[PDB]
């Protein structure tokens, strides 16, 4: 196989691929690898245009969602952060394969473990402390919610970087942040 | 891939720099075309700063403030295989490594150009 | 194979399966996946009855242990938290396979790396900061000790959620917490 | 195969294998397992001789680097921490295989995701909070930088444990710390 | 599995609600039997709250305070395939989704019942 | 591997203890030889403390302060298969488990010796 069926990513160095506040104003690098019932994930977000380059005084949180359908295939429409033309799929070299994901449920967060109506439940969350800029003097929290911004028969991943309130005139930028979850299949 | 190696372009302040980036596409490269130019200024510590972008059949500029209005793709048909750009009225601040990334999943290529700007002509 | 030999879990949505302070007063969701010499684990604990629903003023720590025998098979008796009838074994669908684990040492914490008499050694520990309720205003610490509550030829996993002292009239509940360790085999 | 091609480690219980401040004054236990495009890693460092047993008043940071060549093979010379005779390679039992690593790029940090000149970029970093001694009263930060102490066509891993300033007459010792990164191949 | 689909039961305050949950067991389902009923109250934000449980051949109740003493399995032989329960003297607070989980490793099934309670009779 | 099982050596204060650790090498063990002796003192909580080491064809001592100058390999040719050591002028503080680790990748072996020191002679 030319591609790796155990990995779904945005490629290691994506171009601006999100229009969070304004058109293509951010780069979301996300890689998901399936290891049995657990997905090892590494996410990273950085502002490249507009307010994301200069965190507004009132901003306390910056977040993105990835909503998938019942086959685990990403849906490129609000509120999914990645734009329609953005790379997302099996890994093939430093790029993405053009094949459609046919084992998508292997990467989706398990709904028995994280019921769609349970996003507020601590268990549907994996919360950690990290640092803006990667600067240890600028602590922030990262919360990953599982299936909280769902449909039905659908799945989702939500990433919230909070505690930004006290960080101004700084571009929004996170370190590579790790996380994991039990898989649907 | 891109048709030219990593090169060094030496120009004089005020002149215009032509940063060539021509590419060929493979039959396999069936994904959407993305062209991104980044820059790592010599004067500061920033690296890989987005300068101009071609995504979803549209051009997006206005990313790097100091380079505003002085960057444009040279070709009127990028898809044909030419991602080249021009940096007009060069300033000493423009010195740095400019990178051209041309992507067409699974295809990906990049080229690095080290642009040098001199107060007055001469590399003699 | 109907089941996955690389995963050992309690199923994604177990029923009360621990009698920590009183009979079946808690739900422990635990999933372990073997990735070569490292096990990726995700644990979550939540009180459902008794004092675990209302953290006592004096409570500073809540913890559970899982003790395994020399074959890596779980021992369902004190101090193992999971009750005898609780699901634990290879993953099969959203449930557990009835087969006995025959590759258990592949999921056990390596005793050369984490010697039985070394539980107090920093290396036999993986400590992280997390949040009660998943609420970023309620920071707590999670310490996973490897082979500290052992036998001999035996293995164990210990989970301590501490710093609870200042959290009252709140049900005890953790977010899905990640951890990992080098495997015996 | 006698060895595991998906794991590269220093063995679970290495002898003093680093001469950080003085000859063989520290033990670095490191295990890397390849799970598709992501490496799951667990690192641990402990002083056994000299100033590393008694953190100096002025010490604020303790760190180590591992520099690899273009084939992903470790280079045992400054600034690589592991000494030349130290074990490092595929896992075989509780030891290391004598075979040369031929799939090294599968364990190296991806240069597209973490460009050699980008070590200062937040994305080339994975920063977390942890604790000296594993003691939750002694918080410290761990920063893992990807390809920051590189060559060209080369790769590297850097581990910095900072915030030590206020910890004296204590031997330097970390808990088993987890981390992960996107792989070159 | 469970013999009935997700349903909606509409009763009147004071009445008793019969929440049916009958199941069939497969030859493969050789693991111990567990029956758990959870509830997600409409009046508050709690979800999947344990109401009553059948584990290790014993019944465990007294999990959900507001429902104390008003919940009991209807059958006198659960193992036979009937996990049904009754909620006596319904109150408006009892409104919400009640879920029945029947497990016999590797077997697992669940049913959701949306119970509605009306001040006085009529769904007319 | 090491030629002797885990043993208990009982000596008297002042005497010298001979901690035997002889090993045989396999043809497969083609990696460099490492010999490490650790100790877990009975009097304190420390475990696996490095006492003496043989790495890269050199001896390294001076790790465990309280045992300074009282530990030396007995053989003048370790590579031959003898990692034994002597602990001279035993003190009550020397009580604890001493471990001998002999490694030659992929080969690895270890032996544990429980050393007991008595104020005055007698185990009678």
Swiss-Prot record, chains A, C, D:
Q: What else is known?
A: All late proteins expressed from the major late promoter are produced by alternative splicing and alternative polyadenylation of the same gene giving rise to non-overlapping ORFs. A leader sequence is present in the N-terminus of all these mRNAs and is recognized by the viral shutoff protein to provide expression although conventional translation via ribosome scanning from the cap has been shut off in the host cell.
The record's subcellular locations are:
Virion; Host nucleus
In its UniProt entry, what is this protein called? Fiber protein
Q: According to its UniProt entry, what is the function of this protein? A: Forms spikes that protrude from each vertex of the icosahedral capsid. Interacts with host receptor CXCAR to provide virion initial attachment to target cell. Fiber proteins are shed during virus entry, when virus is still at the cell surface.
Family per record = Belongs to the adenoviridae fiber family.
Describe its assembly: Homotrimer. Interacts with host receptor CXCAR. Interacts (via N-terminal tail region) with pentons.
What are the inducing conditions?
Expressed in the late phase of the viral replicative cycle.
| Domain free text | The tail region anchors the fiber to penton base capsomers, whereas the shaft, built from several repeated motifs, allows the knob to protrude from the virion.
Curated annotation (Swiss-Prot), chains B, E, F:
GO CC annotation, single: cell-cell junction
Q: List the disulfide bonds.
A: 21-100
- This protein's encoding gene: CXADR
Per the database record, which ranges form the Ig-like C2-type domain? 1-114
| This protein's domain notes | The Ig-like C2-type 1 domain mediates homodimerization and interaction with JAML.
**From which residue to which, out of the full length, is covered?**
21 to 144 of 365
**Coiled coil residues, start to end:** none
Listed name of the protein: Coxsackievirus and adenovirus receptor
Query: What subunit structure does UniProt give?
Result: Monomer. May form homodimer. Interacts with LNX, MAGI1, DLG4, PRKCABP, TJP1 and CTNNB1. Interacts with MPDZ; recruits MPDZ to intercellular contact sites. Interacts with JAML (homodimeric form). Secreted isoform 3, isoform 4 and isoform 5 can interact with the extracellular domain of the receptor.
